[PDB]
Design a protein around this ligand. Structure first.
Ligand SMILES: *[C@@H]1O[C@H](CO)[C@@H](O[C@@H]2O[C@H](CO)[C@@H](O[C@@H]3O[C@H](CO[C@H]4O[C@H](CO[C@H]5O[C@H](CO)[C@@H](O)[C@H](O)[C@@H]5O[C@H]5O[C@H](CO)[C@@H](O)[C@H](O)[C@@H]5O)[C@@H](O)[C@H](O[C@H]5O[C@H](CO)[C@@H](O)[C@H](O)[C@@H]5O)[C@@H]4O)[C@@H](O)[C@H](O[C@H]4O[C@H](CO)[C@@H](O)[C@H](O)[C@@H]4O[C@H]4O[C@H](CO)[C@@H](O)[C@H](O)[C@@H]4O)[C@@H]3O)[C@H](O)[C@H]2NC(C)=O)[C@H](O)[C@H]1NC(C)=O
Ligand SMILES: *[C@@H]1O[C@H](CO)[C@@H](O[C@@H]2O[C@H](CO)[C@@H](O[C@@H]3O[C@H](CO[C@H]4O[C@H](CO)[C@@H](O)[C@H](O[C@H]5O[C@H](CO)[C@@H](O)[C@H](O)[C@@H]5O)[C@@H]4O)[C@@H](O)[C@H](O[C@H]4O[C@H](CO)[C@@H](O)[C@H](O)[C@@H]4O)[C@@H]3O)[C@H](O)[C@H]2NC(C)=O)[C@H](O)[C@H]1NC(C)=O
Ligand SMILES: [Cl-]
Ligand SMILES: [Cl-]
Ligand SMILES: [Cl-]
Ligand SMILES: [Cl-]
Ligand SMILES: [Cl-]
Ligand SMILES: [Cl-]
Ligand SMILES: [Cl-]
Ligand SMILES: [Cl-]
Ligand SMILES: [Cl-]
Ligand SMILES: [Cl-]
Lengths: 174, 174
């Protein structure tokens, strides 16, 4: 039984993925056992069966990772602390036959890359961020793409506008 | 007085395009004058303005042309008869500054390609067909893309499943 440091951000993004909120899937490795509760938290429970066996929170749903006009991954931040820093996790969404937690890795100590298989992402346009936006924020994007094509703004100024949109929608915390 | 052979199919597809229904735009060439009434009909009028001047129906809104997971064009069929066949028209939607009927051509006799400029299509992801589908038809599509990657169905069998999806949504006549 663990205490989270902050609460998860609101469920946001593609509508058809919202059904995953409140569900939890787990993967049992030899050393640890991980659980992913999408839009909420990630946790591991060391299965060495010694008395001080570790159980910690790796991250709390905070913001999205948007790269190349798509949802790159889900950012889980502000977990238990390793020392000077709090644990983080980037969940990656991959086409799979069924909702399954497939792998876990540790690129840097206390930073994790979690791969989540689900069939809801098998279509290429499922993780595009443009269809998820409100009718008004699409206009702001439409005007920015045309303005960039008309050479009224720079690729740099265009990049700024997109982050303004994503922040308003709540995909990036700010 | 012109009589359409059938009635135009229901308005279907992206929501932001529905506003064009009941509107009509025209292009005046030297020989003929064309009108496009989106989601309805297409017509040409020889402009000699004599009593026997030609007036014909080129097509009646029937179904979409979906290619590459997007809306390729609008299919207009069952126009006036040329002999063994009824006239057809494929309307193509292009990014333009304003709602404008831009061009008309006749690649093969009694088949026409009509180019309609509109600003509602200027964003690349505006005409994606996946977001317009019901949550269930999205599921049906995801499972079909997954089955194809697992080599349980053929690229040919995949195409048939998609036409079942598009037909169920109402984008294709049946
Ligand atoms: C391809 O697709 C195209 C797109 O869909 C399609 O085009 C559309 O076609 C449809 C079908 O034809 C059109 O819909 C109809 O439009 C008619 C035209 O309306 C306009 O003209 C009317 C003027 O009629 C007269 O009366 C006025 C006052 O009474 C006079 O001021 C006028 O000068 C005019 O007088 C003439 O007629 C008199 C007697 O008729 C005669 O004495 C006089 O001397 C002179 O000859 C206006 O009422 C009308 O105005 C309204 O709409 C405009 C829109 O801009 C507004 O600006 C106005 O403020 C106003 O709101 C237009 O100027 C309509 O008449 C017709 O209406 C009737 O039918 C519907 C359903 O059937 C009824 O619900 C409705 O109440 C009307 O009913 C009348 O007739 C029935 C019997 O017919 C009767 O029982 C009932 O009581 C009533 O009298 C309908 O809306 C549509 O407009 C087209 N749109 C476009 C963009 O083109 C095209 O056809 C397709 N082609 C093919 C080949 O498929
Ligand atoms: C990480 O994130 C995950 C998910 O985001 C968290 O997991 C969830 O934690 C909550 C607690 O905050 C759990 O809810 C409680 O559940 C208990 C027990 O019920 C459950 O287990 C039963 C086992 O058979 C099952 O029958 C229950 O089924 C019912 O409930 C579910 C949904 O709640 C519903 O879908 C079913 O149809 C049934 O209706 C259920 O699975 C329950 O008793 C609690 O309810 C009451 O009591 C508490 C305290 O008295 C009160 O506060 C409540 O408001 C309510 O009145 C409570 O709902 C939830 O089950 C967990 N889900 C999973 C998958 O584990 C996890 O806590 C987070 N951890 C950290 C560290 O952040
Ligand atoms: Cl969506
Ligand atoms: Cl929800
Ligand atoms: Cl892209
Ligand atoms: Cl520690
Ligand atoms: Cl603009
Ligand atoms: Cl936020
Ligand atoms: Cl006319
Ligand atoms: Cl054909
Ligand atoms: Cl394979
Ligand atoms: Cl393919």
């Amino acid at each position: 039984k663990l205490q989270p440091r902050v609460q998860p951000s609101p469920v946001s993004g593609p509508s058809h993925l919202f059904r995953l909120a409140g569900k939890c899937f787990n993967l049992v490795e030899s050393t640890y056992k991980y659980e992913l509760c999408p839009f909420h938290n990630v946790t591991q429970h060391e299965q060495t069966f010694r008395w001080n066996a570790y159980s910690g929170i790796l991250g709390i749903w905070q913001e999205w990772d948007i790269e190349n006009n798509t949802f790159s991954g889900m950012w889980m931040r502000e977990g238990d602390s390793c020392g000077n820093k709090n644990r983080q996790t980037k969940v990656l969404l991959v086409c799979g036959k069924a909702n399954k937690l497939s792998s876990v890795s540790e690129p840097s100590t206390c930073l994790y890359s979690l791969t989540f298989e689900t069939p809801l992402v098998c279509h290429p346009h499922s993780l595009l961020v443009y269809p998820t936006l409100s009718e008004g924020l699409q206009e702001k994007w439409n005007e920015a793409e045309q303005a960039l094509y008309d050479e009224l703004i720079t690729e740099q100024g265009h990049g700024k506008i997109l982050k303004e949109i994503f922040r308003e929608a709540g995909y990036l915390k700010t």
